[PDB]
Design an enzyme around this catalytic site. Sequence first.
Site, PDB file in Angstrom:
ATOM      1  N   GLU A  35       0.809  -1.223   0.000  1.00 11.44           N
ATOM      2  CA  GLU A  35       0.000   0.000   0.000  1.00 11.44           C
ATOM      3  C   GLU A  35       0.844   1.277   0.000  1.00 11.44           C
ATOM      4  O   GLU A  35       0.543   2.237  -0.727  1.00 11.44           O
ATOM      5  CB  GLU A  35      -0.958   0.016   1.198  1.00 11.44           C
ATOM      6  CG  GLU A  35      -2.066  -1.019   1.152  1.00 11.44           C
ATOM      7  CD  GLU A  35      -3.043  -0.834  -0.001  1.00 11.44           C
ATOM      8  OE1 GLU A  35      -2.965   0.184  -0.720  1.00 11.44           O
ATOM      9  OE2 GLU A  35      -3.901  -1.731  -0.181  1.00 11.44           O
ATOM     10  N   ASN A  46      -7.736   8.687  -5.969  1.00 13.95           N
ATOM     11  CA  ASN A  46      -8.503   7.696  -6.733  1.00 13.95           C
ATOM     12  C   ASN A  46      -9.284   8.350  -7.863  1.00 13.95           C
ATOM     13  O   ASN A  46      -9.521   9.558  -7.845  1.00 13.95           O
ATOM     14  CB  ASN A  46      -9.439   6.925  -5.803  1.00 13.95           C
ATOM     15  CG  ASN A  46      -8.688   6.237  -4.686  1.00 13.95           C
ATOM     16  OD1 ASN A  46      -7.684   5.568  -4.932  1.00 13.95           O
ATOM     17  ND2 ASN A  46      -9.149   6.414  -3.457  1.00 13.95           N
ATOM     18  N   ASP A  48     -12.373   8.277  -8.593  1.00 17.92           N
ATOM     19  CA  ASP A  48     -13.655   8.823  -8.137  1.00 17.92           C
ATOM     20  C   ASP A  48     -13.530  10.136  -7.353  1.00 17.92           C
ATOM     21  O   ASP A  48     -14.542  10.741  -6.988  1.00 17.92           O
ATOM     22  CB  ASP A  48     -14.444   7.770  -7.337  1.00 17.92           C
ATOM     23  CG  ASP A  48     -13.859   7.497  -5.947  1.00 17.92           C
ATOM     24  OD1 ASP A  48     -12.745   7.967  -5.632  1.00 17.92           O
ATOM     25  OD2 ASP A  48     -14.527   6.811  -5.143  1.00 17.92           O
ATOM     26  N   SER A  50     -11.887  10.454  -4.396  1.00 17.61           N
ATOM     27  CA  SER A  50     -11.475  10.178  -3.024  1.00 17.61           C
ATOM     28  C   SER A  50      -9.946  10.060  -3.002  1.00 17.61           C
ATOM     29  O   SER A  50      -9.307  10.012  -4.047  1.00 17.61           O
ATOM     30  CB  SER A  50     -12.138   8.903  -2.494  1.00 17.61           C
ATOM     31  OG  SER A  50     -11.666   7.773  -3.203  1.00 17.61           O
ATOM     32  N   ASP A  52      -6.544   8.103  -0.763  1.00 21.44           N
ATOM     33  CA  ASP A  52      -6.077   7.096   0.202  1.00 21.44           C
ATOM     34  C   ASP A  52      -4.913   7.685   0.997  1.00 21.44           C
ATOM     35  O   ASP A  52      -4.053   8.362   0.430  1.00 21.44           O
ATOM     36  CB  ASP A  52      -5.564   5.846  -0.515  1.00 21.44           C
ATOM     37  CG  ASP A  52      -6.652   5.082  -1.244  1.00 21.44           C
ATOM     38  OD1 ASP A  52      -7.843   5.312  -0.985  1.00 21.44           O
ATOM     39  OD2 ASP A  52      -6.292   4.193  -2.053  1.00 21.44           O
ATOM     40  N   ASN A  59      -9.131   5.038   2.758  1.00 22.70           N
ATOM     41  CA  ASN A  59      -9.834   5.860   1.779  1.00 22.70           C
ATOM     42  C   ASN A  59     -10.814   6.860   2.400  1.00 22.70           C
ATOM     43  O   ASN A  59     -11.556   6.519   3.315  1.00 22.70           O
ATOM     44  CB  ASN A  59     -10.564   4.932   0.801  1.00 22.70           C
ATOM     45  CG  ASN A  59     -11.053   5.649  -0.434  1.00 22.70           C
ATOM     46  OD1 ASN A  59     -10.276   5.991  -1.323  1.00 22.70           O
ATOM     47  ND2 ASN A  59     -12.351   5.865  -0.503  1.00 22.70           N
TER      48      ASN A  59
END
Length: 129
Positions: A35, A46, A48, A50, A52, A59
Amino acid sequence: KVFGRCELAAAMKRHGLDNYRGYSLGNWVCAAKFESNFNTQATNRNTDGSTDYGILQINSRWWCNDGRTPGSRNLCNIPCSALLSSDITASVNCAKKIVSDGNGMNAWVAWRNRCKGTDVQAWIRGCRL
Ligand SMILES: [Cl-]
Ligand SMILES: [Cl-]
Ligand SMILES: [Cl-]
Ligand SMILES: [Cl-]
Ligand SMILES: [Cl-]
Ligand SMILES: [Cl-]
Ligand SMILES: [Cl-]
Ligand code: NA
């Protein structure tokens, strides 16, 4: 903060992640490796909109507030910036909620794709724990 492998394993164990929801420490270390490469300051946007955050790339769509993810929730009740601290407490506490949500560690796509089913104990091999 960029953790060393065994240093993160020890911190995760101290914060109660070892065997949390039945996931051994190596699973958590492996997930953090892929990660964030063990970097608490890692962020990734991301598609969309959002973002992380942190060592486990939590998220903003569900788990933290960053003020710029429309229609999102903040189920860990924290600013996403708390997930970037050198102190991993907030990331660990939020990860505990995420892994309890129903799908276990599959919530982390990188864990499913790169850790699940592998020899995850290799991630804590040699570590004084
Ligand atoms: Cl490593
Ligand atoms: Cl393990
Ligand atoms: Cl928001
Ligand atoms: Cl909420
Ligand atoms: Cl906030
Ligand atoms: Cl810590
Ligand atoms: Cl599970
Ligand atoms: Na949010």
